[PDB]
Design a protein around this ligand. Structure first.
Ligand SMILES: O=C(O)/C(O)=C\c1ccc(O)cc1
Ligand SMILES: O=C(O)/C(O)=C\c1ccc(O)cc1
Ligand SMILES: O=C(O)/C(O)=C\c1ccc(O)cc1
Lengths: 114, 114, 114
């Protein structure tokens, strides 16, 4: 799985161990070994949400399977809670794009997962 | 809707109110309330277009519906004009990826839009 | 085609001409004129792969066609080798998302490719 977070929150506001917490939490959430989870956090972004530049986040989760109505809702609960708790970002100011990737469309280690 | 712009144009070249202009213009364009529009601008990027590092942009627009042949062309007219006017980026050096997101695949406020 | 690379590798570690090499190599690979190839490299990223912050990369290749099982594997061979050679990133720590874009969903020069 691959999780990317973009936020206008400053770098100094991201607590230590955030990436590790994201990795653990996502491995738990997806049922995938943490050795496969990729996390990426991009702070200090020039962004706005609903016209306001109040703290906000635009993220995405790419996974080969594990994507669906019920699962995505759990993911949002989780991810929004972490951003609200760890980054002080209001959940109503967070967008998360879900992507169910086909194994043949994910490249890794000189090949694909197909 | 979610609009992201990546450009090699320096930060100093992005005029004040650009994010607000993008928000307004996109709300008009999509017929969605501006309180739902998320805009993100990433300047000073290390990029090239057709081998040249002349001013250029790589963007994407994610929307739940409002995506199709005719609409996408309007969007491009608009977005390219703004980048050409506001950022001095030649429209033939701008790429915009359109994404018709399924409501169940967009997370927000501890859940999805499903 | 559009290729984006995100890595934790410092800027100073990206060799000169890397973007041009990526452009050339991708044009060869896809059979598309290099005047259409867009490349974007984002170094010094705050990321982790499998819990480790050892050098790694999260990339994506968007193309209108030229995407499939066999082609994607070639792309991965190529891209991973360049990252391993040029950036010293282990291929088993690189993810590449492949996207077969529909022409009507790609905006360029005030319109779409439809
Ligand atoms: O989804 C998975 O199970 C996986 O192991 C890896 C993955 C990594 C990045 C990506 O964009 C899609 C899938
Ligand atoms: O498309 C919409 O109408 C919407 O309200 C929200 C949205 C949020 C994130 C995203 O990646 C795409 C759409
Ligand atoms: O696919 C092509 O032939 C092309 O010329 C351009 C392209 C640009 C951006 C993108 O996301 C996909 C394709």
């Amino acid at each position: 799985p691959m999780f990317i977070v973009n936020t206008n929150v400053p770098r100094a506001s991201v607590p230590d161990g955030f990436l590790s917490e994201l990795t653990q939490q996502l491995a738990q959430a997806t049922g995938k070994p943490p050795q496969y989870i990729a996390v990426h956090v991009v702070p200090d972004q020039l962004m706005a949400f609903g016209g306001s530049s109040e703290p906000c986040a635009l993220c995405s989760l790419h996974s080969i399977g594990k994507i669906g109505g019920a699962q995505n809702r759990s993911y949002s609960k989780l991810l929004c809670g972490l951003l609200a708790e760890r980054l002080r970002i209001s959940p109503d100011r967070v967008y998360i794009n879900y992507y169910d990737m086909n194994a043949a469309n994910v490249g890794w280690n000189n090949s694909t997962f197909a």
